[PDB]
């Protein structure tokens, strides 16, 4: 009749195999230091 819209170990494994700030600082640092 009607529709409503309302609001661990895997984590450590992806870090080992490769933070949002880390990947944004590396991008920022690369283009400047050289």
């Amino acid at each position: 009749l009607v529709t409503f819209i309302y609001e661990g170990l895997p984590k450590v494994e992806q870090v080992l195999e490769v933070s949002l700030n880390l990947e944004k600082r590396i991008k920022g640092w690369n283009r400047c230091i050289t």
Partner: peptide
């Protein structure tokens, strides 16, 4: 965190003894 500003990052590395002149 090391600041995104390159010269602030250089100063941080000098203070954290990562790299110096």
């Amino acid at each position: 965190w090391f600041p995104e500003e390159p010269f602030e990052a250089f100063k941080e590395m000098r203070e954290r003894k990562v790299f110096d002149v």
